[model samples]
Target: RTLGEQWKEKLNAMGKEEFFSYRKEAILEVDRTEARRVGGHPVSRGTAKLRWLVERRFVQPIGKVVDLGCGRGGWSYYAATMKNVQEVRGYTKGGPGHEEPMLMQSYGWNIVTMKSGVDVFYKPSEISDTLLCDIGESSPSAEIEEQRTLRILEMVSDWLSRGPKEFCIKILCPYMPKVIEKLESLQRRFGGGLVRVPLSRNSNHEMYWVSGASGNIVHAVNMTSQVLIGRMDKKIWKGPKYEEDVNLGSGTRAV
Candidate 1:
């Protein structure tokens, strides 16, 4: 019944309150939600996100599922060790030593850390399997977010550029319309379909599903979700770029 049910009960049973302390305040807020509000929502924040990937037709896990920037393995752990997947690998900038409570290390899970480039991240051995990304690593900017996102797009464009196809990525969409527009635009080069559809995470007020899966599904789902869900704006996203624009904290650009 707690927020991160994936490991929440186990962690709680293990008496590790501080493990998810970061999620505490918001989850307390979620704890007070009316059951009606919680219903029909993607409230399960743990193994269920993987189920969403499957339900949204994001991937079939025929080969392996790559968790891009997987910090300690939420759904990454599940996709690898749990379901129809053969092998699951996670790439994170943070080192593998940080994996705590010691569960994601089980069989079927492989991880590499401190590698920033997408080039090194994806191996030549694997096919166009799903890329599950929730890279909240650095702030969402041209430096960190945009740069990394673009790199991912470039890789996606490489071998996986076939539409109505097997290759897919289910990522955390930036909430700003301008950012979403930019992300969707970039997503086009890899077969050019699917607007980012919003998914639900009723556990937190600020997060939700952001995928309609494919172009048509993304539209149909986003249309209904437009009335139901709204995402939280990322901080690294400074806002829409203007004709005469600006950079970030360092200095300002002239208009």
Candidate 2:
């Protein structure tokens, strides 16, 4: 069957013909494959994308940074190393809690990963300047996923509102327009615009968003070439390597 009426209506309202096409493409792509996962959680956008965001000042990982659905904590690990980032708390499934100490020691900063599933409550001592939510960990259906994403963004938007500064970046699959609408609303509320991270490959194309940066929706410079430098051996499809056994227990420190 072709795209559903409601789905096309949603995309049609966006106005941009290119946007509609891409959205339709992503919608169809979901039927084949959606979020990519490693172990039980979804894989992160990786250190390179985070690095690009940090240096470009699109996201300032200062004060406290909260990572919802942190997965392997790759972004958390990278964020913790920033000079201004005092602490990073990552919430993951089952709260493996394995990488916390290793990351803390490696970076000499506070990096904590906690567990959360159904009906888990979070109480923080202080608000965070930066929030990263990767909602790929759990998804039932496209319709259900959109609602789940909106609910999570609502909470994330509230958390961002309470802070002195705001920078929330969330990554989800299949390109849901409701999520984009929510992000756009938060952007207007927060006095900023959305940023689209230009990562190579099928999933990263239009899966994530950023708010509270500039006043206009901005596209990040294509850093795929630079980000992939010196890592030619690491194919894009291979995803990121965690090196749990090598980097954690060994004497070698992580970058």
Candidate 3:
């Protein structure tokens, strides 16, 4: 039978509740050694917060998520596995041939490798929420880091015009007057108060959050500045000494 069907069989064997607890348990199923091999930790089984923003603005009850530049569907997997997030898709220029094979499959899991920009975008009305990931650290052309990075932001913005339901974004990019400038412009487009969430140390790079129709950015009262994002790769910047980071598209360097 198909891989996905086989998974269903496994779940049925485990329990009778196919809708939620089982689905959650299935989603939590991850390939750890594989994750470690890829410079990533095991997938997040399910998280209450997948607003999962820069921007560390973990919000949920989401209908869908578009994970741009998804590498191995790391964060996207986290979201799709959650009961709250009904549907989530991971997009990448690197298609199935190049990207790491997904460990598990669910009816909700969707992965797209874009040959053209449209491949990653659609009518915002049909879309749910958007997440634009790392720039400074993930981009290969670090020599022109800022230029390439800012341009990537513009590319990320290209999806917004297609239309979607929520007008929110969690941008994971390091500090620069220009990067913030781009986010501010995006905020104007999304129609929400934009705020930059900063954490102690450079562990996690600065992230910008543009609010939805709801209201301005909100910070948890007891929030700490220790969000760890970004995978550890040889190309990662060593100049900074941030002790903490997290994944939004932001993740810890597994390798």
Candidate 4:
């Protein structure tokens, strides 16, 4: 049987009720008490908010999509199955024996795992068009954070080659001022195609960046900027402080 057929079979094996139950379990594992505090619903309001943002961005029949820091691949699975998304790729800092890989296998979707932070995305040939960095608010070391930001900028540069009309990135807005600065710097370097879309009023920590590219030129849209979107011109340290910087080896330099 073909891969699509196998996927269908797997879906069939798990009835609707079972599938929803499994999904709830996956969400619980990620958010734990928060998931329960939200009433243990199989689907959260964030799911609907995401769908709305995608639709509002006019992202239809997407050729490729990437989910950065995808926890259990739940959002990826939803995008792949329900939306007109073709190829969905997921990245994480963790490896196998984790929830994301298992969930990807269960859903039979294309998922790619990376050891480092989202910065590995500097090499964009390996990524898809729409990149979703749904990183809630995990506090990693300063070094890891900078590396992830650099890689993500590189990936965005690469994605330009594929002629995608639009791109979307969901990130924890409050904790991402520095990262957002990196993005704005990239925008200034590569023209101004970055825009921010507000998702949920209940979610104070997250926002989505939506960008568009046309005629090899990118520009940020002002209308998309909402209260949730951080000020691009805000002064935040572009990288680590000079004193705290560390150089591990010849290959890696602290910026």
Best by lDDT: 2
Q: TM-score winner between 2 and 4, please give it.
A: 2
Instruction: Please write out the lDDT profile of model 1 over residues 1-255, one tens digit for every residue.
Output: 212222223333422333333223221122213312401222124344455445666555544556555554555554554345555565555444443222323334343122333333454434535555554333423234435545554554443533224433433333333335555565564433443322332212122222334454345334433432221222232222112111111111121
Poorest 10 consecutive residues of model 2 by lDDT? 243-252
Question: What's the distance in Å from true for residue 96, model 3?
Answer: 12
Q: Model 1 residue 103 lDDT?
A: 36
Better of 2 and 3 by lDDT: 2
Which residue pairs show backbone clashes in model 2? none
TM-score of 1: 0.45
For all predictions, the C-alpha RMSD in Å is 17.1, 10.7, 17.1, 19.0
lDDT of 4 by residue, 171-252 (tens): 4332334555666665565442333333233112233545542221112222222221332222331321111111111121
Off by over 4 Å in 3: 1-41, 44-57, 95-101, 105-143, 165-174, 191-204, 208-255
Report the C-alpha lDDT of model 3 over 167-220, residue by residue, as the tens digit: 334344333346546655765676554333332122223344444332322231
**By lDDT, highest first, what's the ranking?**
2, 4, 3, 1
Q: Evaluate residue 49 in candidate 4 and report its C-alpha lDDT on the 0 to 100 scale.
A: 44
Residue-wise lDDT of candidate 2 within 106-197, one digit each (tens)? 35233545444422125442467777765443342445666766776666665666673646455442235565567667667775544545
Give the distance in Å from residue 158's predicted Cα in candidate 1 to where it truly belongs. Answer: 4.9
Candidate 4's C-alpha lDDT?
Answer: 0.41
Judging by lDDT, tell me the better candidate of 1 and 4: 4
Candidate 3: Cα lDDT at 113: 23
